[PDB]
RNA sequence: CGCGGCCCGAGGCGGCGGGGGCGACGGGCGGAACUUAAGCAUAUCAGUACGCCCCGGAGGAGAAACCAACCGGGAUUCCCCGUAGCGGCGAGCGACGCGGGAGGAGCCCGCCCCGAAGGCGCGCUGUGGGGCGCACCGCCGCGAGGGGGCCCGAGGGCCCCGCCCGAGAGGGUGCAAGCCCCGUACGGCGGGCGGCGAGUAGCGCUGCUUGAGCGUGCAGCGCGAAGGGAGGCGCGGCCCUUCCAAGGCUAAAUACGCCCCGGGACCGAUAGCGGACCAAGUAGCGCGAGCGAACGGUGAAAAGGACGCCCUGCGGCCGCUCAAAAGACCUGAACCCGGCCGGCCGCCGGCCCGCCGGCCCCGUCUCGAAACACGGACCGAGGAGCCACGCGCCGCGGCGAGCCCGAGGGAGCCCCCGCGGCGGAGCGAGCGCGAGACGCCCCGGGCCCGCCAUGCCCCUGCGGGCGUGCGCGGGCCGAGCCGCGGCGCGUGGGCCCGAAAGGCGGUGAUCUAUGCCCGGCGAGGGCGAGGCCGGGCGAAAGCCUGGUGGAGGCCCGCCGCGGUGCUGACGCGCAGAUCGCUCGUCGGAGCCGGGCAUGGGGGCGAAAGACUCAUCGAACCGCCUGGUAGCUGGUUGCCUCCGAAAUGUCUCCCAGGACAGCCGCCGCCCCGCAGUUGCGGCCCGUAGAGCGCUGGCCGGCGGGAGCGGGG
RNA sequence: CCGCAGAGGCCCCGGGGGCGAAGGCGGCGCGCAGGCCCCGCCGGACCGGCCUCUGGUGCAGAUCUCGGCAGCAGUAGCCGCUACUCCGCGCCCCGGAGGACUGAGGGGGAGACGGGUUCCGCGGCGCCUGCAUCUGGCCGCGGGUGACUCGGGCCUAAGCGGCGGGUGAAGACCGGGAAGGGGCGUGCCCGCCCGUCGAACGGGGAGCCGGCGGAGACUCCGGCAGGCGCGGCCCCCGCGGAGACGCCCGCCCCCCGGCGACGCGCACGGGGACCGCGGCGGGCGGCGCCCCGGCCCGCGAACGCCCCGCAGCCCCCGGACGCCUUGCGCGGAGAGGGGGGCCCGGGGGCGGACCCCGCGCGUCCCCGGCCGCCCCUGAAAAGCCGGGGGGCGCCGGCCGCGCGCCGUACCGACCGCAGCAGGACUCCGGGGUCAGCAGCCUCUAGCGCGGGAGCGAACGCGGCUCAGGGAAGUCGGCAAGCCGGCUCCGUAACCUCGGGAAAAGGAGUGGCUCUGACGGCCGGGUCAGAACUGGAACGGACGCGGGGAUCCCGACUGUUUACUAGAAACACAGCGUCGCGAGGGCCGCACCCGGCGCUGGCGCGACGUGAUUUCUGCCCAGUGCCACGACCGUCACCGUGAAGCGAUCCGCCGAAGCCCUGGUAAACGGCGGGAGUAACUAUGACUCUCUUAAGGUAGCCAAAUGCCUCGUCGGGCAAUUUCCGACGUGCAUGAAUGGACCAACGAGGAUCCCACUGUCCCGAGCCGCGCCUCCGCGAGCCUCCAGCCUCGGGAACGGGCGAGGGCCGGCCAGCGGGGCAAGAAGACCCUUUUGAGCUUGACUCCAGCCCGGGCCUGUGGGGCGGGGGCCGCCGCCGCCCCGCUCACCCGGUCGCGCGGGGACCCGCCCGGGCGGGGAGUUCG
């Protein structure tokens, strides 16, 4: 046979993300001495649309603390943030929607977004439109805090990791049908080359393990083991069960 | 927080080096497959092709941590000579020592002693010096000797008579030249003590490699030393014989293309190099890597064509130069053709010559070809069992218990000298033992040697002698060595041409597939969604009606973009995919241009195994490669003498082979033969015949002990 | 033995030769033959008998190689693109006259790419210009491309390269962690880190008119302007307004900004150019009759100054149910009103330059303010400018100079072997008819293209008409025909309520003469009505749906086998499952390193089904997958114990895996037989029996799926192997390998009805081109030889052979019975110890991944188990756990005021497991 679609994707070429006309990487403000002691004030300048992304981005201007002038940031906007609003970051930031503060100072039961797994990594956990995390409990003896992820799993992170109050803006996007093939075309034209999708049973044996036969059908079981080598891992990988169980 | 030394680093300046090129030879790495094994996977091809790196006129190797087992040799290289071994123990593969030659050459550093005596801006983290005690090339030149007659366009021709010679090699000149010219032969000049190399040697595990076999050489990882290494079977112990690794240098004898010189039983213009021609790796072909032709000749001398006459010009005639037009050119065949002149159907035979008689188209495979089996329009030229090595047998020559142009050396292609080797004794796994008795020749017996087994005797004793018994090879008064020729087989492209494939290194996204960036484009109509305004109804919620508005992968339709049907035209085309009508779509998942990206078992794919420059169920270019073929086609003069088989056994054998049979040639010897009848002895169970045996099968008539049916 | 080429010898005064060698042509003789010899003619310088030696040594064939050449044959052919004629002069060149065409998406006028001199003048016909040629893109000889303002040179896009270094046997490939530059002017100050690479369409400082040559022009000349620099002379450090703002011009550094700079769309408004109508002036044509009715011309740039400029945005007074668009929209966060400011690719006046006058619909281009749309939001940089703070100081006017390098002719003359009906990007776009940039005719401009004449057979190609009938033709209504514009009337079942729908189906339409309606302080077209009148005619050419009733498949728009398949195949929205929380998942990759990822579960990746509606049954025995399930048995190296001279051998120890215990079917898949039985018969609700992991549920059916089979019954027909409706123990239906149903849609498959017709009964007539005859030009394929039949025998179907019957010789137009006609070493079938693609529970293996030990690799503490009761020595052996930081690793930061892990991981060596993802090979 020849190389499969999954094997060809990993080599780049016509399978790279289309990044032209993107505003940049969205991140929390970097951690420094000024906000390790007090608070730093900024102002929201604009709210913009990012190609490929479902959630809006906000441009926030802060004073420069190692010289003269100003510093421009790029945040993921929580719901309810408006142009001209002033926000704070630091150990002494107040509990308002746009503010950034460490999770140790956030009361249990609060909604947070753009949480950082390890201190000083600039956010990585709740970044897609409509998502949020919950602060569950604190442990002052070990200095660790428990959170609940959008998938429902529970994780322990250090109490010095920062987050933003609120939930990500743009919630409800997936409640509307795409309806037409032309809509999915535009959606994926803003992201990467991955659409439309040809079924494996509709191919010839030379280019997929599912192809061939006098009727269209999968010859064997579709569950493959975890240790299958790269050209073999197609179908359901290491599935614990299959079918529509119906219960919890 | 400052500044001096040492150490470790940074920027600049000066002077010196490096890099790239070379179809051979040389060194170091990486590393195939075709092919053979009648299949194939270990093996082989091959430590090859090819890729990468690096010198030189040579390179590399080199002065024992060597061979050997001897009444020993003694650094490296090159020539002559020849079997241990490895191996689906198959096919295949394969060294070295001893011996004879060419050439010949030896040494250093570290460690140890002194310590700046040194190459002095460096260097004690070591420069410099030493062992300490006993005892063929090039350049320049000169260079002899014939006339007369005849006849030719010109003689180097014919006849007669001469000369030169350290020169009679050759070339030129109007026809075969020692003496017509240049050259050829004969010249000159220049050039006792101290001290021996550590992440090493070795070992364990793993990979490659070798003839190296319980390891030939190398390497990775782990462990890791003091006297050490080797002696072609491992381990432990004790001896003997030999050498001193883990640092370095070195001439000679040897190999070889381009370029220059000489020679040849070589080719002679479809040959010889692809390339004999004032322009060839040229013209021309391909996006590119690459591919790559054809074309020689007047005559001694260009003397390369006078004059004249016709002609509207184009041209023609007549003649001129020359030995000759040999006139763009030597000679000038065949096929095919025009004129004039003679005939009427091919071949063989007879004849007073058109009558009679006979005659299917060759080559090939085949039981069988005129075949409706294949190849062949015609003509010319080219066109296919050669060579090397190995093995067997035959003939001839020389010498003969011997024989022998090895390499090489003597300045003599042909002369002189010149080792192995083979032969001379076999058998046996091996320790080992070891032949006489007869014979024109041949065959056969009989004895003897070795291997195996036995009986008796005895010294020096699992040792000697004598005898006996089967089988296998050898022997009994040596026949070989070298060379030349032939026949057959094997290994090499291997008589000539012919695959579908496999490998190595390179070149392409002008077409086409997908993506990204920058630009551009879409006549005219139809339908009439949300939102908004007026009027009416209603208790309220709300509803009814007229207008406005201008949504949509909506509809009709032009250019564009496609490609349905006629299964129309064309189908030696306009065209290696076109033309005409008819048709699908036409604001969108639309169409078009340029730039850029993805590369071959890879890419790209709204998926047809589609497309990737007329090439895709694996592109193109060159090379391995004249790849292999038990299969199809072809394989070139005459006469004479002999003359088959299409069967048996085995075979991954059934379209092929080996052994036997049939046949040819070459012989040799001298010993009665026969595909026949007659006479004498013995053997066989077929035709026919038959129903005694083994089976089968119609009835008739008698006896009834016993049994059954029925009266 | 004959012959060929060459070597060593002989050839009696030293072989034969211009008194004529080799070779060629014709003719005798000799030899069984292979061959040899002699004679005549041609030719013009070499040749060879005998002996010994040597070899690239003798041709009819190979779909042989190279060269030449025949018949066929004066044959096939010189059919697209409407067309030429008379005279000078010749069908083709030039001129005049006539007749036509392309038809503004041009056979027009110009560029980009590609070509490379094809361009121009003079001359010419040897080649080419498939006929001719006096012509030419052909041949010869001379010429021809001018830039401060146009393009390139500069910028950056998608990309490419470089980078102390890293890796690999190299070639090479990969790359942020590295003491990485300037200024002013000599001393100080500032500063983390690439590119004068990549766009003759994107960005960009500035050009217009007139004229001149033979071939060049935004380039030359004349005139009039712009931009950017340099040098002299004079030469200034801000005022007005109530405000929006105005008016006369400062630079350098740090920071903050702007311009450059950006989507699509139906409409609405403005400007320009084009177009048309009327008037006045100038010129022309025709004129049988009319004609102030026909045609042509009447021009004004860049740039400078002054006025005007709707909508938009802003200022002042003051304090509201008003203002206003086609649509909207706005107002106490300040409307209307009155009075002002700013921008506006534009217009007017005066200059440039001694300007005929008015009016209007439409077309194209550009601009404007709004509104609508997106799970789509519609480039960047050089360069230029402004503001704040700081530091500095003439900065403008006049007058002079200057502006380097390269492209530049011409062409669809380009690619397809060619002067090939193919392919090949863009710009400008008149009149009439009309909805129209459609079709048809035409002004401007261009131009008669592989040649002509005759004739008017068959037959072909492209067209036309046809009595009566009307699908009877045929596999099949294939082909052709019918319909069609606009206005009015009228439109069913069904439906996802949006459609169906132009459903179906009717009627009207010309010309002329009139009437009314709709604006403005002249104009315009449109809509409606009436009389009259033409062969019972009017969308009079052109352009332009035939319709209806049903079944199957796919929801729909879309895509596909370039060159035989456009579909029911693929895609699709929707639905469902599975994996992953970054120290992760999936993939690339020889190594170093990469992609998703400028990402973070409303995400990313892997699969199946395939809109809506209604549903989606039972089975975990098999195979697969999964257990932070369990360590039962087995299962490595290493380690450790016993024995041994040693090599070694025997035990223990026991990671993953398997085994074991469970879960899982929108995982792969699977889903039964035999008997008896109800008051006629028949059937079987019911009973018995064997048996599975479970025994096919809801549905559906002789279906695109039913062998038997043309199943049985009903409908439709005169008559039906077709079609529709039912029936069902269904060879072998069936539930996301999805079941059933379905409005809209379809160059999809199928049956019937209306209308229509040469499809047919059954053919006839006609038009143009070819054919045919002529002048000019002029090939391919094929070919053992030949070319009349019947029978026989024969490789079993003869042109030839045996026996009979016929036939002078030579040609033409046609034709398709033969020549087993041609085109190709059968692709079907078999064999060969010949392949390749693909599969897997064939056999032998490899990457990759998982798991264990050792090295890398430090510094401390502790627990357990082994060397009647222990106590062990504190040194012996194993396994295990918890710290610290210094190795090692990861993150943040411009190293401006700091983190996370950690002796584990990673890497390397050896060992075990998984492993059609991949490789090689076999398949008597
Ligand atoms: K799919
Ligand atoms: K080898
Ligand atoms: K045959
Ligand atoms: K045949
Ligand atoms: K011999
Ligand atoms: K390939
Ligand atoms: K046989
Ligand atoms: K009997
Ligand atoms: K440019
Ligand atoms: K020009
Ligand atoms: K899907
Ligand atoms: K199971
Ligand atoms: K069925
Ligand atoms: K019936
Ligand atoms: K269709
Ligand atoms: Mg398919
Ligand atoms: Mg497969
Ligand atoms: Mg199929
Ligand atoms: Mg230097
Ligand atoms: Mg070979
Ligand atoms: Mg073989
Ligand atoms: Mg073979
Ligand atoms: Mg083979
Ligand atoms: Mg070998
Ligand atoms: Mg050397
Ligand atoms: Mg002389
Ligand atoms: Mg001479
Ligand atoms: Mg030493
Ligand atoms: Mg080997
Ligand atoms: Mg020994
Ligand atoms: Mg040497
Ligand atoms: Mg030649
Ligand atoms: Mg005769
Ligand atoms: Mg006869
Ligand atoms: Mg043959
Ligand atoms: Mg045969
Ligand atoms: Mg036969
Ligand atoms: Mg024959
Ligand atoms: Mg010949
Ligand atoms: Mg003898
Ligand atoms: Mg050959
Ligand atoms: Mg070959
Ligand atoms: Mg192979
Ligand atoms: Mg390209
Ligand atoms: Mg392209
Ligand atoms: Mg729209
Ligand atoms: Mg549409
Ligand atoms: Mg056709
Ligand atoms: Mg034809
Ligand atoms: Mg790859
Ligand atoms: Mg005979
Ligand atoms: Mg066998
Ligand atoms: Mg009998
Ligand atoms: Mg002569
Ligand atoms: Mg020869
Ligand atoms: Mg011949
Ligand atoms: Mg003709
Ligand atoms: Mg016309
Ligand atoms: Mg031009
Ligand atoms: Mg010209
Ligand atoms: Mg020319
Ligand atoms: Mg410019
Ligand atoms: Mg310029
Ligand atoms: Mg550039
Ligand atoms: Mg531009
Ligand atoms: Mg000028
Ligand atoms: Mg010009
Ligand atoms: Mg020009
Ligand atoms: Mg070409
Ligand atoms: Mg053309
Ligand atoms: Mg019919
Ligand atoms: Mg019929
Ligand atoms: Mg039709
Ligand atoms: Mg469809
Ligand atoms: Mg469609
Ligand atoms: Mg096709
Ligand atoms: Mg088709
Ligand atoms: Mg049922
Ligand atoms: Mg059925
Ligand atoms: Mg039915
Ligand atoms: Mg049917
Ligand atoms: Mg019918
Ligand atoms: Mg079934
Ligand atoms: Mg199910
Ligand atoms: Mg099914
Ligand atoms: Mg015949
Ligand atoms: Mg006959
Ligand atoms: Mg015919
Ligand atoms: Mg015929
Ligand atoms: Mg064949
Ligand atoms: Mg064939
Ligand atoms: Mg066989
Ligand atoms: Mg194979
Ligand atoms: Mg395989
Ligand atoms: Na070099
Ligand atoms: Na040299
Ligand atoms: Na010749
Ligand atoms: Na001559
Ligand atoms: Na015969
Ligand atoms: Na044959
Ligand atoms: Na033939
Ligand atoms: Na004897
Ligand atoms: Na349409
Ligand atoms: Na297929
Ligand atoms: Na070959
Ligand atoms: Na002769
Ligand atoms: Na030959
Ligand atoms: Na004219
Ligand atoms: Na038109
Ligand atoms: Na979707
Ligand atoms: Na099955
Ligand atoms: Na294949």
């Amino acid at each position: 046979g020849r190389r499969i679609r999954v094997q060809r994707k990993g080599a780049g070429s016509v399978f790279r993300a289309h990044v032209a006309r993107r505003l940049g990487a969205a991140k929390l403000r970097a951690n420094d001495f000024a906000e390790r002691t007090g608070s730093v004030r900024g102002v929201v300048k604009a709210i913009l649309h990012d190609r490929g992304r479902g959630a809006p981005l906000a441009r926030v201007q802060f004073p420069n603390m190692r010289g003269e002038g100003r510093v421009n940031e790029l945040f993921i906007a929580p719901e309810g943030m408006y142009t001209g609003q002033e926000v704070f970051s630091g150990n002494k930031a107040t509990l308002h929607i746009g503010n950034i503060l460490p999770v140790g100072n956030i009361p249990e039961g609060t909604y947070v977004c753009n949480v950082e797994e390890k201190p000083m990594d600039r956010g990585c956990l709740a970044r897609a439109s409509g998502t949020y995390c919950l602060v569950v409990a604190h442990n002052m003896e070990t200095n660790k805090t428990r959170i609940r992820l959008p998938s429902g799993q529970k994780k322990l992170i250090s109490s010095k990791a920062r987050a933003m109050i609120g939930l990500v803006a743009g919630g409800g996007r997936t409640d509307k049908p795409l309806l037409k093939a032309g809509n999915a075309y535009h959606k994926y034209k803003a992201k990467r080359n991955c659409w439309p999708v040809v079924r494996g049973v509709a191919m010839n044996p030379v280019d997929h393990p599912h192809g061939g036969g006098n009727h269209q059908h999968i010859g064997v079981s579709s569950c493959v083991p975890r240790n299958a080598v790269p050209g073999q891992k197609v179908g359901l990988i290491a599935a614990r069960r299959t079918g529509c169980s119906g219960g919890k």
Side-chain angles (χ1 to χ4, degrees), chain A residues 48-67 69-94 96-104:
Chain A
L48 312 158
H49 166 91
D50 192 48
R51 182 189 178 192
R53 194 186 310 264
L57 304 186
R59 214 201 263 111
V60 184
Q61 208 169 64
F62 287 93
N64 189 356
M65 257 84 51
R66 67 176 295 165
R70 272 125 66 162
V71 173
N72 302 321
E73 272 293 326
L74 196 49
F75 294 174
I76 301 195
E79 180 144 344
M81 162 192 262
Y82 64 96
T83 207
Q85 152 182 25
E86 49 98 11
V87 297
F88 302 82
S89 166
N91 282 25
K92 281 166 207 359
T94 288
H96 285 85
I97 296 280
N99 288 9
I100 291 142
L101 38 141
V103 288

Side-chain angles (χ1 to χ4, degrees), chain A residues 82-94 96-143:
Chain A
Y82 64 96
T83 207
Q85 152 182 25
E86 49 98 11
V87 297
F88 302 82
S89 166
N91 282 25
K92 281 166 207 359
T94 288
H96 285 85
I97 296 280
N99 288 9
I100 291 142
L101 38 141
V103 288
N105 305 337
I106 301 175
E108 288 121 311
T110 304
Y111 293 51
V112 292
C113 60
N114 214 3
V115 202
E116 71 190 15
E117 268 167 341
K118 294 188 177 183
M120 312 208 250
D121 81 15
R122 308 190 69 186
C124 81
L125 287 194
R127 289 167 48 93
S129 81
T131 53
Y132 67 77
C133 286
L134 275 180
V135 182
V136 173
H138 302 298
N139 183 289
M140 267 68 56
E141 311 278 313
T142 206
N143 207 40

Side-chain angles (χ1 to χ4, degrees), chain A residues 194-205:
Chain A
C194 62
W195 179 99
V197 190
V198 187
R199 290 168 298 112
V201 283
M203 309 184 177
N204 295 298

Side-chain angles (χ1 to χ4, degrees), chain A residues 6-22 24-67 69-94 96-247:
Chain A
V6 261
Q7 303 184 275
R8 302 205 340 253
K9 273 172 187 179
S13 71
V14 296
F15 292 111
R16 305 193 262 121
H18 328 124
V19 294
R21 301 183 310 276
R22 276 196 196 190
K27 266 138 56 147
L28 288 184
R29 197 191 186 261
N31 203 227
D32 67 348
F33 177 83
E35 73 197 80
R36 270 196 291 265
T37 58
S39 325
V40 173
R41 179 178 157 272
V43 181
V44 175
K45 279 320 219 233
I47 309 192
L48 312 158
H49 166 91
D50 192 48
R51 182 189 178 192
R53 194 186 310 264
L57 304 186
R59 214 201 263 111
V60 184
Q61 208 169 64
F62 287 93
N64 189 356
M65 257 84 51
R66 67 176 295 165
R70 272 125 66 162
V71 173
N72 302 321
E73 272 293 326
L74 196 49
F75 294 174
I76 301 195
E79 180 144 344
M81 162 192 262
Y82 64 96
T83 207
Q85 152 182 25
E86 49 98 11
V87 297
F88 302 82
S89 166
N91 282 25
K92 281 166 207 359
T94 288
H96 285 85
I97 296 280
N99 288 9
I100 291 142
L101 38 141
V103 288
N105 305 337
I106 301 175
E108 288 121 311
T110 304
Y111 293 51
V112 292
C113 60
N114 214 3
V115 202
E116 71 190 15
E117 268 167 341
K118 294 188 177 183
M120 312 208 250
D121 81 15
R122 308 190 69 186
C124 81
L125 287 194
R127 289 167 48 93
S129 81
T131 53
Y132 67 77
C133 286
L134 275 180
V135 182
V136 173
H138 302 298
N139 183 289
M140 267 68 56
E141 311 278 313
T142 206
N143 207 40
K144 285 248 167 51
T145 165
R146 178 106 45 60
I147 59 170
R148 221 265 299 261
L149 296 163
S151 71
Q153 282 157 238
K154 314 248 186 173
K155 207 200 227 155
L156 272 187
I157 64 176
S158 100
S159 271
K160 324 188 75 52
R162 311 174 282 150
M164 207 204 249
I165 320 289
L167 42 70
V168 183
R173 179 174 44 84
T174 50
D175 294 353
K176 175 192 200 178
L178 290 159
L179 186 60
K180 298 160 46 186
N183 283 327
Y185 166 80
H186 292 293
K187 173 191 189 174
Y188 294 112
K189 179 138 160 111
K191 297 149 106 74
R192 66 200 80 85
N193 187 34
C194 62
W195 179 99
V197 190
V198 187
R199 290 168 298 112
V201 283
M203 309 184 177
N204 295 298
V206 65
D207 43 53
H208 203 269
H210 287 182
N214 272 344
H215 304 287
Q216 271 196 20
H217 78 305
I218 304 170
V220 294
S221 170
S222 325
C223 302
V224 293
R226 177 62 82 176
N227 212 48
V229 304
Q232 276 181 314
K233 224 180 265 191
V234 297
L236 317 177
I237 293 134
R240 272 151 211 129
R241 52 160 299 146
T242 43
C244 307
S245 45

